[PDB]
């Protein structure tokens, strides 16, 4: 019966909780009771990038650690040169309600999306000197929240409906559709090996997917509100999440569980962006109370504060070589810290 | 102290800044407003009339119209799910929200009031005014005159209600219709005056879908909202 199946599922649900308790033997805080504290980290603004006309929602770094792309709700993508603060390209968009941006690892393409239900791919290297739309991807029934490249002919997108998709750019179709969420999906993070990814949705749950099969291997719970940002530790065996309950958490893929909670009583506002440093020792988070914040990823102590923005921080990224951190806000400014 | 190639890169970056300064003028001279409503509410016909004058899963539609040489952009979200709490945050800089509600349902009216309450008490939609259209007044007048279905079996407070002294009846309409149409308006205003705090306001209007004056009403109402902001910006209150 339907009730019996639910009872069977509940009995099956009780089994999972037993396994988690058995493997728990200690805490990360306990094992980190001897490592010397990092201390205090002073970040100072090096560059301020002016030019956008409205709120800034998205930002991605290039692989060369010098070029940068940003999106605003005025209809513009600007490609910057971080070292010189001069503008390389300015791409006008067909829709103006943009919410995501991406930069291809090769360096040829950029992508954008938003409330128009469409992921658009631009070609930055043509025989002529202008940027053109190479492909418009359609097939989602809800707003796009994140998009990430895998190579020049594959991309992964997450949308308002509880689904994520893998696309073939040349053809224009959906190779695999990932289903199993019950709420709006808000983020994606590709693993360094580019064979797994994690999504966090507005149902207090995060899931792990296999790109070449289409199945969900693990489900991670523990939050209480919406999850807005997710990222991998630079090893492929851990990921961090930010939510609207003013907390961040760290999970482990091989011993599925929670390890640390990054919370403090002075702050009540939610988290809007999460990233790691190159070594995995610093975890940076952006907040709704107009300032960014820096955490130590093994002791849960606030190490530093970045405070230079007059409105909320929306995007945050760390370069590949680890020499800079860029933050965008709703004051129409990008700031590079070092 | 700069090379020939690096000197020509700055010149390119200055022909971009010029074009981005010609777009700040158009952006600042155009007003953006968001249209909200239900399925039974006739928000589509208002779009048709305002466009007639002055992809299959697309989720946003835009309409241009100008009155007295000021440009207006109207946005209608069409293909998104029922949950709303996440994409409203993108609309915290618009001039106004137009909330179009049917007045002849009498059974879906309660669900309309709860929807208005959530928009008014949102954390991101403060300092944003609402221009509500009490649509479909032609159908409402017929229903009350025939007297087949009463307005007292869904709101018991109707019997104790009397027409306010500040009324303004149209020429030649049954006072029963006037009493009915002002009761529905007062339900929506009870929500507005509970938590306004003077940061944003609610502008009522009675409309029919065929009316050609809807464009003028928005223009008059917007002219008040920008005025109110300028008194704060220029330090007068």
């Amino acid at each position: 019966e339907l009730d019996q199946l639910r009872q069977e599922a509940e009995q099956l649900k009780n089994q999972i909780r037993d396994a988690r308790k058995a493997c728990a033997d200690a805490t990360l805080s306990q094992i980190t009771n001897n490592i010397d504290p990092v201390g205090r980290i002073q970040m100072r603004t090096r560059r301020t990038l002016r030019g956008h006309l409205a709120k800034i929602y998205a930002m991605h770094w290039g692989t060369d650690s010098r070029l940068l792309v940003s999106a605003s709700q005025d209809g513009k993508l600007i490609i910057w040169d971080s070292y010189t603060t001069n503008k390389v390209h300015a791409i006008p968009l067909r829709s103006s309600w943009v919410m995501t941006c991406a930069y291809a690892p090769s360096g040829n393409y950029v992508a954008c999306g938003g409330l128009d239900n469409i992921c658009s791919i631009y070609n930055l290297k043509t025989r002529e000197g202008n940027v053109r739309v190479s492909r418009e991807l359609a097939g989602h029934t809800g707003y796009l929240s994140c998009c990430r490249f895998l190579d020049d002919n594959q991309i992964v997108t997450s949308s308002g409906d509880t689904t994520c998709a893998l696309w073939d750019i040349e053809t224009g179709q959906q190779t695999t559709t990932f289903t199993g969420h019950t709420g709006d999906v808000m983020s994606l993070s590709l693993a360094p090996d580019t064979r797994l990814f994690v999504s966090g949705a507005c149902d207090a749950s995060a899931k792990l997917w296999d790109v070449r099969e289409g199945m969900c291997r693990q489900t991670f719970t523990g939050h209480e509100s919406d999850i807005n940002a997710i990222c991998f530790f630079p090893n492929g065996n851990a990921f961090a999440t930010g939510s609207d309950d003013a907390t961040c958490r760290l999970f482990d893929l091989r011993a599925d569980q929670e390890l640390m909670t990054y919370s403090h009583d002075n702050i009540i506002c939610g988290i809007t962006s999460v990233s790691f440093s190159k070594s995995g020792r610093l975890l940076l988070a952006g907040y709704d109370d107009f300032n960014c914040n820096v955490w130590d990823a093994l002791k849960a102590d606030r190490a530093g504060v970045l405070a230079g923005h007059d409105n909320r921080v929306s995007c945050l990224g760390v370069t590949d070589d680890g020499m800079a951190v860029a933050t965008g806000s709703w004051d129409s400014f990008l700031k590079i810290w070092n | 102290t700069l090379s020939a190639e690096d000197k020509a890169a700055v010149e390119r970056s200055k022909m971009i800044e010029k074009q981005l300064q010609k777009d700040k003028q158009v952006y600042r001279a155009t007003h953006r407003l968001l249209l909200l409503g239900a399925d039974n509410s006739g928000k589509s016909t208002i779009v048709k009339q305002m466009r007639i004058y002055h992809v299959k899963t697309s989720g946003i539609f835009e309409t241009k119209f100008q009155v007295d040489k000021v440009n207006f952009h109207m946005f209608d979200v069409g293909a998104q799910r029922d949950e709303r709490r996440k994409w409203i945050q993108c609309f915290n800089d618009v001039t106004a929200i137009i909330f179009v509600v049917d007045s002849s349902d009498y059974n879906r009216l309660q669900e309309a009031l709860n929807d208005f309450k959530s928009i008014w008490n949102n954390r991101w939609l403060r300092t944003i005014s609402v221009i509500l259209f009490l649509n479909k007044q032609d159908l409402l007048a017929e229903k009350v005159l025939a007297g087949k279905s009463k307005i007292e079996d869904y709101f018991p407070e109707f019997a104790r209600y009397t027409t306010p002294e500040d009324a303004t009846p149209e020429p030649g309409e049954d006072p029963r219709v006037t009493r009915a149409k002002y009761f529905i308006r007062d339900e929506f205003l009870r929500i507005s005056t509970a938590s306004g705090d003077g940061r944003h306001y609610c502008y009522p209007h009675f409309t029919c879908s065929v009316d050609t004056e809807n464009a003028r009403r928005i223009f008059n109402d917007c002219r008040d909202i920008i005025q109110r902001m300028h008194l704060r910006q220029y330090e007068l209150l």
């Epitope: 010098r66 002529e128 000197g129 | 090379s3 020939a4 890169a9 010149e11």
Partner: single-chain antibody, 229 residues
Framework: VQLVESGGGLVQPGGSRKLSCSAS????????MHWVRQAPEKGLEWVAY????????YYADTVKGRFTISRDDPKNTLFLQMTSLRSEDTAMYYC??????????????WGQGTTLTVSDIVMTQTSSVPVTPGESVSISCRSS???????????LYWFLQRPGQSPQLLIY???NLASGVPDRFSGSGSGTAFTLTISRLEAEDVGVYYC?????????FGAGTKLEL
Amino acid sequence: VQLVESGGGLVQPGGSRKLSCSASGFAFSSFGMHWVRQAPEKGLEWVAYISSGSGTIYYADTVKGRFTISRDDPKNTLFLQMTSLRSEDTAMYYCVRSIYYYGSSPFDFWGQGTTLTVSDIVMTQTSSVPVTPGESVSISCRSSKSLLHSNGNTYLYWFLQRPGQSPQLLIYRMSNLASGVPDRFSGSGSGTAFTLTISRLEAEDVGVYYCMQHLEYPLTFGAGTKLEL
């Protein structure tokens, strides 16, 4: 893309003529353009340069005062004005396309050229080399000043001219390989010492080679190294 130019002819001494190049197939308004000329049996020499937006105009030493350059963006044509011609102005003039931003490749496309007849970081190059298919050639040209700027990139460019054709780009900034050229071509060197290496030589790549500098104006070319089969 295509660039076709016209205006050449016979011009009596002390006269004047106008040259125009028509552009079709690319974003003309966002591209600066140059002018180069070639004597009847000699190398290349730079003439003028008009930038995007017409905010930067440079002329060569043997050019200032006599020649005037201009462009017409909406009509997609640029004009060169010639006044008081002499006997040293007999050459075939070329129009060259160039853009400048991070990672750009200037001097990409070269036109067919127009014929006209009338009635400083010096670059030294080597004048011939025998060519047998399968061998590996090495062409070297030296410079009178270091081309390695402080930013970190060297401004040396390599060009190739097959018989009866316009020059084509091979290598830009001494290490980068042009778009559309085979991977056998390679370039390397240091300050004031450059070399171009070709591995596994095949037919249809014999001709003259040129090396150009771009650290500061005016741009200086080389005599030309000829490979014959």
